[PDB]
Ligand binder design. Structure first.
Ligand SMILES: OC[C@H]1O[C@](O)(CO)[C@@H](O)[C@@H]1O
Ligand SMILES: OC[C@H]1O[C@](O)(CO)[C@@H](O)[C@@H]1O
Ligand SMILES: OC[C@H]1O[C@](O)(CO)[C@@H](O)[C@@H]1O
Lengths: 445, 443, 443
């Protein structure tokens, strides 16, 4: 409470009719406001965890209520309506004369019109975190909330043309909200999908059509976990198998179901893995396996229990063995390796914000520290959590809590990073609070 | 003729009745899935049979595929939407007993979803009705239910603001990984056309009215979106080229955040003054400027493109004839992904090397769409020329599945011979030429 | 042991007698030519049998291959030299009757010539005699005639000033297009070794003296040429790097006109101070700086390299252990051809992608040569380590033909399992380790 960071977090709070309802993304005094003066649903999560652990839960309750109201608001682009269940990427408070009102971005204001797919999942997860932290079960059981959950599930569980139980998205549909070759079936979306289904199973009442929703949830839940665990898992044993796959196999009972051509498996993968390491791949689809390591997807896979115990140990072993690549001078690298040269051009459409080792394209993101700490505590690798926190702690305050860091090893402050980025401040606080009392990790697991 | 006899021998029979045609009758290559009837491949065969007058095979096909729609489809305990039509099917027997076996994507190479198959089914059902006058078929409760299941799948709520359909890579005629994921033109145009057909085929009875309302609504949004965002011409390119990056807000010009420095050099030089086309794809940070022939030709036929847009697409074909027709109509898409682009986008797919197969190969089947579109736009002479090019080679080459090279000079690297829709494509084109009124069945 | 039982089941029988061993016993892959006994592959099998004491199979092999040498070999009316030994052979039957069928290059993929096979035959005949003490075999007129035919082919006059042997690409263990055309080290070293063996095996009777004289003469010139022009160390690299281009005349330093700007960057950093090796190739305007393991190890064993050179090759292995042994001894050559170099040099050969198969793959069979060379140079501890690496994986992996990756971590992309010379290689290495005196049979 008396810390510098806590006071920065307090100033970030957004008020609405005299009540705290969220936090701004950043308080950078110089850069263009752009959309950084808005409360992003994904950014609020670590803020919420600080507030819940501290004991002031009104802000989180208020956030959940107002975002539920935003769900019923109308969204249009060229006058077409998406599903009613879509949660917004972000919102802020405006005022026309005397009265305050909330304005939101559901993707129709967003740069590149990216859909905030992860936002509705984070909302479910935060609702669950709220329940477990406070003990207040009544909020989620209110008819409003039940309906809101169900609208999210309608979109998530929408019928597919394909045989894949994964969720299909366009590029830039999560924390990585720009064109980064994370289209189709990105790990992060699948892991958050799995976690949200697990949560919905706790939150849903069987009343009315509730039993119908639970049925839909449980069927997808098992299929999704099987699919991810069996086809996304990468280790040396599995790589040896994939590398020897024959191409152009037709039929049900074939090994190479997705028609991966082993001559396309990148050079770096084979040398990068340690004997006792492993990870969930970045993406899988027709003719495609994305071997990039994505930190958020893997860490949440440990916390949500999607990964098995052994798989969770092997992910942490990878972090230990490739510490320079994945932590370096600032935890945690968002994905590894960076897209470079002509691959950057082709995959990102020459996006100047995502040059090699910058931002989404292999930058290091302080916020991810809270996930890493949680995961390290859960797998009983506390020493890793401690070293990671020590690294971040030695720079963040001095650098004024940047949004992200750049370079192979995170040496540079992010090229266009906002300073006083709220989830960089909150991430460090959450990590320290988890370390001080490891039982609080149960809020997210 | 030689072609008719070949088409006849391709017919699959089931309990004594014709129900479809095999993809190819190659004497030497591995069967793989080429001994099956593909829903997309059967379309031109069906047209031959409809115009000839033997319509039983088409009626039977429509009935058997409807039945297949209700088959149990599964991979590792997951079910797709109930409306999904198969990629293909064949007949198998246990002793005396015969039964149909289908690939819904669970057997398919790379597990690609046959998203186009359900749209082609609706279009063929409409073509059947218009051509025969048999209104009894589509009216049947089973057929009404079947159309609706497809609409349930096509119109299911999504996360994005736009009304286009989201698909994985390889979801249509291009059924391998080719960077046609997200919002490929072919899917959007087939979707539009299928919706227009559904509008005519749905009975109002019960919830039919609800379906018709949703269809009408989507048709409007879809036509607007496609025409206003996919259309490429010199004037539009000048606009896009001058777009500012990283615009945030509802009221911005560069909504999808295209960076003009990434616009390929070939595009600006390739378009003639009076030419234009619908782009291959659109999504976050992405515009695929490749020209896709099927999408563009079907846009003309379905009335998705305006009359002027249709004329400008045909102007493009005339001006860039060597590129898009060359020695074999029609080039499936232009230009080819080359070098490291081929590696990155296809995952080093050996069947789609540059200027081969899906990656800028030339496909004889497309001649029937080109001929239809040419007739509709009043470019009869282009139809004559394209038909003359194909007829000069196909028979001598034993009707290859596809041709390769910048200008289609090579027989396809792995092309099957006696590919059914290559034979049916030529026949259909000549039938249309003889009686242009038959173009109505697909327009 | 498991390995012995596997080696036994690989034996080919012919009219009731053992005459060779199949290349692999893969339960699943296409036979291709892996159901044949290769002359090069049989060598380590032969050594196992010689050291065990069952020498009939080796005697029978030598006899049957000699007979094959006299078989009619043809492609489009052209005959090679009469001394050519086959790449491989197998047994076939017409009803009850059995007969041998051989591949001399006329069946081979890419029509590659098995130049190494005839040299391996001579070396095995010498190994047989030394190990058994049966001097009656090589003395037979038929065997004398057979040795001479091989020498006629090896020593036939050529156009070049140097005494090395000119070959097309893919003429040895590396039997595919890998830029090992012209004067590859392996051929020159095997040639030298075969000549040394021929010196012991030839009777003086009749023209035997003439042959012995030519052999003696070539041995001298060949050893000088190889040692003085193929040897690479830091001191030599400093010389070559400072060579002037386009020197004309007898008395010039840069005889082969190597341009020092073309010397690859990796070479200078890779060599340790006390390390060195024989280069992979030499010819007009060309020095192939790739390290080739078989050539270098056989140079040690045949006494072609000096004692110091032998120690410096072993120093290279110790210093660059991860590169040359890694997780599976031994890397066939280093480094891999990559990117456009792979395309240009291999013609985009899919079996030889970077760090795979011939193109920098790791080959268990080579362990027997490495162990022999290590014993001979007094580096017993390196032998122990390499053997420990292989034994920790081969049985669990079902004895793959080869391993892939920079450090041999992958099982070979298209590796057959139960590859005979992988099994025989390990057994031979352990046999040598137990009794180093047996190294004499190949030295
Ligand atoms: O609206 C989407 C935009 O929002 C950001 O997260 C911050 O401005 C960008 O990464 C993205 O382009
Ligand atoms: O099952 C899908 C496969 O079917 C084909 O159309 C023909 O074999 C291929 O293009 C594709 O990979
Ligand atoms: O016939 C020559 C062929 O035999 C092989 O050794 C095994 O199939 C290949 O390396 C080569 O291409």
């Amino acid at each position: 409470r008396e810390t510098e960071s806590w006071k920065l977090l307090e100033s970030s709070i957004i008020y609405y009719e005299g009540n705290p309802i969220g936090t701004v993304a950043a308080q950078d005094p110089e850069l263009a406001a752009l959309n950084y003066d808005q409360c992003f649903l994904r950014d609020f999560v670590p803020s919420a965890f600080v507030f819940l652990m501290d004991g002031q839960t009104d802000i989180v309750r208020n956030f959940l209520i107002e975002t539920l109201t935003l769900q019923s608001h109308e969204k249009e682009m060229d006058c077409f309506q998406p599903g009613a269940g879509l949660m917004p990427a972000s919102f802020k408070v405006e005022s026309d004369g005397s009265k305050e009102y909330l304005v939101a971005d559901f993707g129709e204001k967003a740069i590149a019109r990216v859909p905030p797919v992860d936002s509705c999942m984070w909302w479910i997860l935060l609702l669950r975190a709220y329940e477990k932290a406070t003990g207040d079960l009544t909020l989620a059981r209110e008819p409003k909330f039940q309906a809101g959950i169900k609208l999210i599930l309608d979109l998530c569980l929408a019928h597919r043309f394909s045989m894949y139980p994964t969720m299909l998205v366009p590029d830039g549909a999560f924390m990585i909200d720009r064109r980064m070759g994370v289209y189709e079936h990105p790990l992060e979306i699948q892991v958050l999908f799995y976690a949200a289904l697990r949560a919905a199973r706790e939150l849903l009442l069987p009343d009315g059509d509730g039993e119908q929703y639970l049925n839909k949830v449980h069927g997808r839940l098992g299929a999704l976990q099987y699919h991810i665990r069996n086809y996304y898992w990468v280790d040396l044993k599995r790589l040896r198998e994939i590398y020897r796959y024959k191409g152009n196999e037709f039929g049900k009972e074939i090994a190479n179901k997705f028609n991966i051509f082993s001559q396309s498996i990148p050079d770096w993968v084979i040398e990068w893995l340690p004997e006792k390491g492993g990870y969930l791949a970045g993406n899988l689809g027709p003719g495609r396996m994305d071997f990039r390591f994505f930190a958020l997807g893997n860490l949440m896979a440990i916390l949500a229990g999607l990964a098995s115990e052994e798989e969770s140990q092997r992910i942490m072993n990878l972090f230990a063995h490739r510490w320079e690549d994945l932590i370096g001078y600032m935890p945690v690298k968002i994905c590894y390796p960076a897209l470079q040269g002509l691959e950057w051009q082709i995959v990102t459409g020459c996006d100047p914000k995502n040059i090699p080792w910058s931002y989404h394209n292999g930058g290091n993101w302080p916020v991810l520290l809270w996930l890493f700490t949680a995961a390290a505590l859960k797998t009983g690798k506390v020493e890793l959590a401690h070293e990671a926190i020590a690294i971040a702690e030695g720079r963040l305050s001095n650098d004024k809590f940047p949004e992200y860091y750049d370079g192979n090893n995170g040496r540079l402050i992010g090229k266009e990073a906002r300073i006083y980025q709220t989830w960089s401040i909150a991430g460090l606080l959450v990590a320290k609070q988890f370390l001080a009392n490891p039982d609080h990790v149960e809020f997210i697991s």
